[PDB]
Amino acid sequence: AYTTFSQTKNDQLKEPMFFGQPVNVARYDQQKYDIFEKLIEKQLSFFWRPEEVDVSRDRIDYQALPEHEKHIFISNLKYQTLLDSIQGRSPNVALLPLISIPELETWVETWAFSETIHSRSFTHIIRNIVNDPSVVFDDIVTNEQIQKRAEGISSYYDELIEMTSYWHLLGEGTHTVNGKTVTVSLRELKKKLYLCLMSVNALEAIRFYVSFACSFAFAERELMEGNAKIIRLIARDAALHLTGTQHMLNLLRSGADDPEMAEIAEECKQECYDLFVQAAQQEKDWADYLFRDGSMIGLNKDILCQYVEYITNIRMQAVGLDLPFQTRSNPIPWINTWLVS
Amino acid sequence: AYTTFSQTKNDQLKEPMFFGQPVNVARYDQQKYDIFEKLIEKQLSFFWRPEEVDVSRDRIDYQALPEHEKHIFISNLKYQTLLDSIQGRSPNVALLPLISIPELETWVETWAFSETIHSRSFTHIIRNIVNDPSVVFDDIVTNEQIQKRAEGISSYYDELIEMTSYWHLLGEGTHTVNGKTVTVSLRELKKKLYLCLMSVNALEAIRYYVSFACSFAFAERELMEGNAKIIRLIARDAALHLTGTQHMLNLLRSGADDPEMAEIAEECKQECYDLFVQAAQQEKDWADYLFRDGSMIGLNKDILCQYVEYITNIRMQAVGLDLPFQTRSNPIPWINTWLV
Numbered sequence: 001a002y003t004t005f006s007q008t009k010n011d012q013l014k015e016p017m018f019f020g021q022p023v024n025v026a027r028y029d030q031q032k033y034d035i036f037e038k039l040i041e042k043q044l045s046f047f048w049r050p051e052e053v054d055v056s057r058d059r060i061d062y063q064a065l066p067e068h069e070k071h072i073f074i075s076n077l078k079y080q081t082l083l084d085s086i087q088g089r090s091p092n093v094a095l096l097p098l099i100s101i102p103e104l105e106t107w108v109e110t111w112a113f114s115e116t117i118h119s120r121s122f123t124h125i126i127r128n129i130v131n132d133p134s135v136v137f138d139d140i141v142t143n144e145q146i147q148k149r150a151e152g153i154s155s156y157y158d159e160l161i162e163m164t165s166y167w168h169l170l171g172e173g174t175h176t177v178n179g180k181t182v183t184v185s186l187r188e189l190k191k192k193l194y195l196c197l198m199s200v201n202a203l204e205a206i207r208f209y210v211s212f213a214c215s216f217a218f219a220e221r222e223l224m225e226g227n228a229k230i231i232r233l234i235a236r237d238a239a240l241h242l243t244g245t246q247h248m249l250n251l252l253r254s255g256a257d258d259p260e261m262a263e264i265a266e267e268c269k270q271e272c273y274d275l276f277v278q279a280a281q282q283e284k285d286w287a288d289y290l291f292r293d294g295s296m297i298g299l300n301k302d303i304l305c306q307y308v309e310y311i312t313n314i315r316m317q318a319v320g321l322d323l324p325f326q327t328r329s330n331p332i333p334w335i336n337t338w339l340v341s
Numbered sequence: 342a343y344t345t346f347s348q349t350k351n352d353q354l355k356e357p358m359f360f361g362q363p364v365n366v367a368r369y370d371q372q373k374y375d376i377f378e379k380l381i382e383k384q385l386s387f388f389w390r391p392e393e394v395d396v397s398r399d400r401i402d403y404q405a406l407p408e409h410e411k412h413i414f415i416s417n418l419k420y421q422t423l424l425d426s427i428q429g430r431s432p433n434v435a436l437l438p439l440i441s442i443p444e445l446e447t448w449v450e451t452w453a454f455s456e457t458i459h460s461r462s463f464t465h466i467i468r469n470i471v472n473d474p475s476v477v478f479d480d481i482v483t484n485e486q487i488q489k490r491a492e493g494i495s496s497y498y499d500e501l502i503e504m505t506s507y508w509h510l511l512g513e514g515t516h517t518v519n520g521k522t523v524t525v526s527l528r529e530l531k532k533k534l535y536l537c538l539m540s541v542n543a544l545e546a547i548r549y550y551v552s553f554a555c556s557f558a559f560a561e562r563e564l565m566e567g568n569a570k571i572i573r574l575i576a577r578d579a580a581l582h583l584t585g586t587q588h589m590l591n592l593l594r595s596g597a598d599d600p601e602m603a604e605i606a607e608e609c610k611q612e613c614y615d616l617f618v619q620a621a622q623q624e625k626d627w628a629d630y631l632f633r634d635g636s637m638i639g640l641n642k643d644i645l646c647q648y649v650e651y652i653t654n655i656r657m658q659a660v661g662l663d664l665p666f667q668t669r670s671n672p673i674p675w676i677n678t679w680l681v
């Protein structure tokens with residue numbers, strides 16, 4: 001029931017963001033929600049090339065760091081690398097099959113494309129600071145701490161993908177497969193979509209932002225500056241991605257786009273809240289590990305933890321969730337010099 | 342059984358291109374096949390923004406055209422729009438979920454991304470030459486002739502997607518779904534993938550080049566040079582897209598990748614052959630519609646038909662197939678200028 005070109009003539013301005021008729025014609029002269037076209041344009045105006053950034057002095061900087069500083073750095077790098085591996089493919093594989101408006105379709109492909117460039121930038125850094133990048137790359141997959149910090153990201157995507165396949169193959173219903181009853185419900189699939197979006201919004205809004213705080217800590221010190229320039233270009237793209245997820249979520253709950261989606265959202269608020277908090281907690285628990293055999297100079301477990309709280313509150317308010325934490329002003333205003341967005 | 346982040350630590354240098362373990366880590370320090378890394382680098386090096394191309398004059402030029410030349414121009418643009426509309430999403434939705442090596446995975450995401458830029462370029466041309474793009478765009482879906490020429494593109498893709506879903510959900514075997522037997526054979530899915538690919542190769546290498554010809558015809562009479570700059574940029578990218586499909590196809594047949602794939606390529610050859618013949622006849626048939634209200638000095642069903650046979654033979658030979666048409670010199674050598 002999924003089609004690469006639906007032959008029905010339809011008003012693309014009247015479809016919902018998700019679950020309506022798959023997009024046929026790709027046109028950009030008009031949009032239901034212009035935010036998406038605006039986001040495609042800015043992201044294209046931001047196009048950059050990693051290799052164009054000189055990281056030649058980062059190797060010695062890294063060599064000269066203290067062992068626990070190498071640890072904090074490399075470790076944070078491995079996490080950023082993991083998130084972008086996932087983000088390079090997921091939005092395409094997970095969302096494309098469910099989008100019903102063209103501007104949203106292309107924004108998703110552009111967004112995913114910008115993420116592959118981030119991944120290439122990490123190969124650029126890694127290749128220039130270590131002797132055998134393979135060590136770093138292998139560690140990303142099995143590293144217990146990161147599977148830990150990043151736990152449940154791949155799973156929200158995976159289940160949504162699975163459910164979408166059943167929905168496209170069998171459609172709404174109670175069916176049977178190899179002696180098992182399999183129930184397919186649109187509403188539960190819309191809930192799966194909603195929660196997956198929420199989780200990608202936290203990935204973009206928080207998980208990535210926390211990593212920036214670590215990278216920029218080195219930059220503040222004039223250390224690993226090739227990495228810093230690259231991370232600055234990345235945070236600028238991240239700002240657009242988060243705008244995109246905020247808008248999709250806000251349009252969904254507001255009921256304007258899909259009445260049923262607004263109901264689903266509302267009824268799942270506490271579920272939504274807990275994930276957000278759960279996510280903040282993961283980032284804190286990791287700030288823990290990273291700082292235990294030693295603590296960086298200008299950042300530490302407590303400062304990072306305060307930062308996790310501060311941004312989390314900002315992000316949750318943005319999509320109408322309650323503030324889980326104590327209100328406080330930014331603990332590391334020096335970060336602003338690097339977050340040009 | 343499809344996963345966005347496979348937790349097994351695998352030597353990505355040893356996976357087949359497709360059907361292996363899904364890619365986890367996206368690294369570009371090494372490649373099983375460096376041709377894909379090279380296409381990624383070249384494509385990124387060619388990054389361009391349509392709206393920056395000056396199409397200002399094209400509106401006068403267009404208004405000045407005889408209605409039949411207008412018909413010919415627009416009907417062409419419309420098919421072009423259609424092919425990039427499908428190519429923008431297709432490679433991601435059909436291929437991504439089956440790729441098992443990082444370079445090819447990112448190559449496909451980069452290729453698709455470049456097609457959405459092609460589509461942006463048509464919206465830029467259309468809005469700068471007509472009063473309501475909506476007529477043109479609404480005319481694409483329902484245009485039977487358009488639809489007739491494109492027949493079978495969306496279908497190969499959609500069927501491959503459905504089988505892939507069954508594969509991911511049930512795994513190989515014969516299963517019982519809603520009281521019916523469904524068979525999921527990997528060999529079979531691999532055949533569907535292989536033919537999809539062959540079909541995409543023909544889409545990139547033959548269907549698009551015929552459209553360029555028609556596009557460039559105007560440019561030779563010094564008309565619609567805004568559209569020509571864009572078509573030239575597009576042509577530049579399509580050449581990378583076709584080099585990517587040819588390699589994928591040739592690598593699979595060489596038996597250097599998945600061996601089973603090399604026997605499928607051999608067993609399917611007549612099918613590969615027949616699909617090119619059909620696409621070719623489809624392109625010839627279009628001519629009857631393009632030239633509805635008349636031809637133009639230098640471009641007619643006749644020249645179109647010969648160009649079709651000409652390029653088809655070159656593309657089939659590139660993937661090791663027999664040439665169905667008579668050999669002949671390029672019937673429109675002035676095209677090479679714009680092609681490079």
Ligand SMILES: [Fe+2]
Pocket residue numbers: 084087114115118234
């Ligand atoms: Fe990223």
Ligand SMILES: [Fe+2]
Pocket residue numbers: 087115204237238241
């Ligand atoms: Fe991002």
Ligand SMILES: [Fe+2]
Pocket residue numbers: 425428455456459575579
């Ligand atoms: Fe294209």
Ligand SMILES: [Fe+3]
Pocket residue numbers: 428456545578579582
């Ligand atoms: Fe192409």
Ligand SMILES: [Hg+2]
Pocket residue numbers: 094157196197200
């Ligand atoms: Hg998601």
Ligand SMILES: [Hg+2]
Pocket residue numbers: 153156157195196197199200
């Ligand atoms: Hg998700």
Ligand SMILES: [Hg+2]
Pocket residue numbers: 076210211212213214215304
């Ligand atoms: Hg950090």
Ligand SMILES: [Hg+2]
Pocket residue numbers: 072073076213214215217218296299
């Ligand atoms: Hg740090």
Ligand SMILES: [Hg+2]
Pocket residue numbers: 210211212213214287304
């Ligand atoms: Hg941090």
Ligand SMILES: [Hg+2]
Pocket residue numbers: 194195198264265268269271272
């Ligand atoms: Hg929720």
Ligand SMILES: [Hg+2]
Pocket residue numbers: 253265266268269272
């Ligand atoms: Hg919510």
Ligand SMILES: [Hg+2]
Pocket residue numbers: 198199271272273274275276
């Ligand atoms: Hg949430």
Ligand SMILES: [Hg+2]
Pocket residue numbers: 284304305306308309
């Ligand atoms: Hg905290």
Ligand SMILES: [Hg+2]
Pocket residue numbers: 435498537538541
């Ligand atoms: Hg294909």
Ligand SMILES: [Hg+2]
Pocket residue numbers: 494497498536537538540541
């Ligand atoms: Hg195909």
Ligand SMILES: [Hg+2]
Pocket residue numbers: 417551552554555556631
């Ligand atoms: Hg043509």
